[PDB]
C-alpha cells in the first residue's frame, strides 16, 4: 500500500502555474458542490496563462446520463474542450497535472480487477498522468462504497475541502503568482 498526501492550495497553485497540460476530471462531488462556475473560471485562467486545458468526462460521471455536460454547458465551457475517455485516455501520460473534482469511482483503478464491484466499468486513466490532485471534502466513499488506491499513489496529492471553496481559493492564489 501507500499513503494519503494532503496538499495545500498554495502548493496546488504552484503545480498548476507551471504546467503545460492540464486535464480536468469532474465527478458527482463537483455537481453536489455546484462548483461548475469556479471550475470554468480556473480553466479560463490557466488558458490565459498559456496552459493547455481539457475536460475528461466519464460516461457515468455524476448520477444521471450527461450530468457533467449539463453543468459545464451552464458554466459556459466550450464543447470542444469536453472529451470522452476513448479520446482522452491515451493522452494521459502527457498530462502534467490531472485535477479530480469530486470524482472517485470513475477514476478508481480497481475497476480493472475482477473482485471489485466496479469491475466491467471502463475507467479514466488518470493514474497514468504525471501528477494528480484530487479535490474532495475528505474520506467520503463513492457510489460503490469502495476505497480508491488512486488516492494513495505516489503522484497523487489530496486537496481537501468543498469543491467550490477549494477552486475559489486556488484561483485567488493563482492570481497572486
Amino acid at each position: 500500500k501507500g499513503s494519503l498526501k494532503p496538499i495545500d492550495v498554495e502548493d496546488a497553485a504552484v503545480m498548476l502555474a507551471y504546467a503545460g497540460k492540464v486535464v480536468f476530471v469532474p465527478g458527482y462531488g463537483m455537481a453536489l458542490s455546484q462548483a461548475q462556475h469556479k471550475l470554468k473560471e480556473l480553466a479560463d485562467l490557466l488558458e490565459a496563462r498559456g496552459v493547455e486545458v481539457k475536460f475528461a468526462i466519464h460516461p457515468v460521471a455524476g448520477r444521471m446520463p450527461g450530468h457533467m455536460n449539463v453543468l459545464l454547458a451552464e458554466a459556459g465551457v466550450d464543447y470542444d474542450k469536453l472529451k470522452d475517455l476513448e479520446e482522452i485516455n491515451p493522452e494521459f501520460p502527457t498530462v502534467d497535472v490531472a485535477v479530480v473534482i469530486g470524482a472517485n469511482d470513475v477514476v478508481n483503478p480497481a475497476a480493472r480487477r475482477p473482485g471489485s464491484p466496479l469491475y466491467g466499468m471502463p475507467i479514466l486513466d488518470v493514474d497514468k498522468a504525471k501528477n494528480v490532485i484530487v479535490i474532495k471534502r475528505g474520506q467520503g466513499k463513492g457510489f460503490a462504497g469502495v476505497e480508491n488506491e488512486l488516492f494513495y499513489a505516489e503522484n497523487t496529492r489530496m486537496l481537501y475541502g468543498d469543491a467550490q471553496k477549494v477552486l475559489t481559493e486556488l484561483i485567488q492564489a493563482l492570481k497572486r503568482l
Binding site: 468526462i57 466519464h58 460516461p59 460521471a61 446520463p65 450527461g66 455536460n69 449539463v70 464543447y79
Partner: protein
C-alpha cells in the same frame, strides 16, 4: 382643463387570439393614477385573468355593448371589430395593433367613423421608446417559443450528453434573421445546449448574436455581379446544409417575407432537419412553409407558426399591457385625458385623426 379619463379594454375576438390589452395588475396602476378602467366580461380569460381579478384591481366589469360608453381610450390587441367601431364616441382614441394589409376593411370602417387611432406597429424603433415597443415584446415571446417548438419537432437532442449509451452530439441550430425574435431564439436554443449559428446581413446584429455566444455566419463577401450573387447563395446553402434546425425570422414591414430557404437549399437538408419559419405570417422565409401548419417533405419538418404570442398568453399580455401602460404616459396626465399630439412618438404612431389617414403607405393601400 381636461376630462377625467376612462380607459376601455375589450375581449379579443380575432380567430386564435388569446391576449388581452390590459392585465389586472396594470389596470390597478391606472386606477391608482386616477383613471377609470372599464373591461368587457371575460376579456382576460385567454390569459387566465378572471373578471373578479379586474374588480380587485379597481375596474368596472361590463357587458360589451356598454364598454365604449363614456370612454376616451380603447386599448386593444387586434383592431376593434365593426360592433365596437360603431360605438366609438367623439374624442376617443383607439390604441392597439392595426396592420392595414391584414385588416383593411376594419381600417376603412374606422375612417368612415372618423376615428382616431394609434397603431402599435408604428411605434418608432428608437431608444426613448423601447418600453412602449409592442413589436419587440411580442418578438421576444415568438423567438422563445420558436426555440421551444424546434426542440419539440427535432428528433434529436439539443444538448451534448456524454452517457453510458454513447456520446450525444449537440444539435446545430441556425437562426436566420437576428432581430429581436432571432436573438431570443439564440438565447433559448443556447440555454438548451445547442451549438448556435447566426445569419444576418447587418454587422451589428451579428455582434449582438456573438455576445450571446452564437457563431456568426460570414459569407465570402459583405450591386453584385450575377456570379457573386451565386457564389454568395452557394456559400449560404453550404452552411445551412450541415444544420439540424433552421429558425427563420426575417420580416419587412408592408412587404412579403424574403425567401431565405429556396428549393435548391431545402434539397440539401438531411431528413429529420427542422425548419421553424417565424415569417409565415407575411409569406414565410421558406418555400415549403404552409402558414399555421406543420409539413414534412423528404423528412424535413417545416412549421409555420402563426400567433405564438397567443400561446404564451400570460406573459405576452403582461408585456403588451406594460407597453400600453408606458405609452399612456403620453395619453394620460394625473388621471386626465391629455394626448400629447406634439410628441414624436405619437406623431410617428398616429395612424388617423378624425378620419384623416396620416400614414402614407396606409393612405395608398386604402386608395
Amino acid at each position: 382643463h381636461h376630462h377625467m379619463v376612462t380607459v376601455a379594454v375589450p375581449k379579443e375576438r380575432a380567430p386564435g387570439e388569446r391576449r388581452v390589452a390590459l392585465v389586472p395588475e396594470v389596470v390597478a396602476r391606472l386606477v391608482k393614477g386616477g383613471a377609470r378602467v372599464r373591461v368587457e366580461r371575460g376579456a382576460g380569460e385567454g390569459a387566465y385573468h378572471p373578471d373578479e381579478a379586474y374588480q380587485e384591481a379597481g375596474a368596472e366589469v361590463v357587458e360589451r355593448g356598454e364598454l365604449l360608453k363614456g370612454a376616451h381610450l380603447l386599448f386593444t390587441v387586434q383592431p376593434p371589430p365593426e360592433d365596437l367601431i360603431q360605438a366609438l364616441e367623439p374624442g376617443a382614441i383607439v390604441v392597439g395593433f392595426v396592420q392595414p394589409h391584414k385588416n383593411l376593411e376594419l381600417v376603412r370602417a374606422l375612417q368612415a367613423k372618423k376615428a382616431t387611432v394609434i397603431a402599435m406597429e408604428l411605434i418608432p424603433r428608437i431608444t426613448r421608446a423601447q418600453s412602449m415597443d409592442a413589436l419587440s415584446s411580442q418578438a421576444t415571446v415568438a423567438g422563445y417559443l420558436a426555440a421551444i417548438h424546434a426542440a419539440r419537432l427535432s428528433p434529436r437532442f439539443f444538448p451534448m450528453l456524454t452517457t453510458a449509451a454513447g456520446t450525444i452530439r449537440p444539435a446545430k441550430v441556425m437562426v436566420m434573421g437576428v432581430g429581436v425574435a432571432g436573438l431570443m431564439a439564440i438565447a433559448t436554443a443556447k440555454r438548451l445546449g445547442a451549438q448556435v449559428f447566426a445569419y444576418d446581413v447587418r454587422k451589428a446584429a451579428l455582434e449582438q448574436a456573438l455576445s450571446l455566444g452564437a457563431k456568426p455566419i460570414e459569407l465570402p463577401i459583405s450591386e453584385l455581379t450575377e456570379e457573386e450573387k451565386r457564389i454568395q447563395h452557394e456559400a449560404l446553402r453550404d452552411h445551412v446544409a450541415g444544420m439540424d434546425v433552421l429558425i427563420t425570422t426575417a420580416q419587412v414591414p408592408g412587404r412579403r417575407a424574403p425567401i431565405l430557404l429556396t428549393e435548391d437549399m431545402v434539397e440539401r437538408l438531411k431528413p429529420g432537419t427542422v425548419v421553424v419559419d417565424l415569417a409565415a405570417e407575411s409569406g414565410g422565409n421558406c418555400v415549403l412553409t404552409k402558414p399555421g401548419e406543420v409539413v414534412e417533405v423528404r423528412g424535413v419538418r417545416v412549421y409555420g407558426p402563426l400567433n405564438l404570442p397567443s400561446e404564451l398568453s400570460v406573459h405576452a399580455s403582461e408585456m403588451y399591457a406594460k407597453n400600453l401602460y408606458n405609452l399612456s404616459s403620453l395619453l394620460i396626465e394625473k388621471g386626465a385625458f391629455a394626448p400629447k399630439w406634439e410628441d414624436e412618438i405619437v406623431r410617428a404612431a398616429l395612424l388617423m385623426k378624425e378620419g384623416e389617414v396620416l400614414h402614407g403607405p396606409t393612405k395608398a393601400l386604402l386608395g
